[PDB]
């Protein structure tokens, strides 16, 4: 299948070179997989989700996304127009308030929830979790991310946006999960992207068009936007039977575009998420 005039990021992940505008993907499109977006919520009623999205848990007064951030990330995972895995099932877990912040204790609770909840869902091709959030180092937070991964969920997390070594941020610094850096449409490391030996992979993160609240769309930038590209890719590959939750991050790294990125400091991987599609 081919989506013409696609968002640049979707084009980038199905191409060996920058500057193309068609997203090439197998028609299976993540069907039978499930992705938990742990964030500000998801506006499930947005037409772009086609009824494939639902809120399953909130830690605040309502389950609505009053912010936009969660809806944007979810769109990049699995909306029709803006998503990597266009037929996946999306589940929303609201651990961030409508200002986009949340206590570590709540974020941990949301991760433990997913490890359990997945056992009540029909996700025959596997389960992914996308975490476009983080803060200062906490061994508790890292440990929660490690538990979620260990339970058989592919965990993808943002490297963070401090233009610094991700070793000082959580859950970015947990080695066992898939830590995602950001690139721009010219194959530069995004100027804000964290780096360091703990990064596993890069994805598109500068000027990413996706869904927003009020049934709208907008472009924003962040390692928050790169993470769902990788989460979406994992769900897509699991559906095709190429990898499993336990080994998806390693498979994505092994099959990536290598050496394409500029402004990567010594000690940081030069690996860009790639779907290897051949028609
Ligand atoms: Ca290349
Ligand atoms: Ca890792």
Residue numbers in the entry: 1 to 279
Sentences from the paper on this structure:
In addition to the standard model system, i.e. proteins such as hen egg-white lysozyme and proteinase K from Tritirachium album limber, we included phycocyanin from Thermosynechococcus elongatus, human insulin and the SH3 domain of α-spectrin (α-spectrin-SH3) from Gallus gallus.
In this work, we report the first SSX experiments with viscous jets conducted at ALBA beamline BL13-XALOC. Small crystals (15–30 µm) of five soluble proteins (lysozyme, proteinase K, phycocyanin, insulin and α-spectrin-SH3 domain) were suspended in lipidic cubic phase (LCP) and delivered to the X-ray beam with a high-viscosity injector developed at Arizona State University. Complete data sets were collected from all proteins and their high-resolution structures determined. The high quality of the diffraction data collected from all five samples, and the lack of specific radiation damage in the structures obtained in this study, confirm that the current capabilities at the beamline enables atomic resolution determination of protein structures from microcrystals as small as 15 µm using viscous jets at room tem­per­ature.
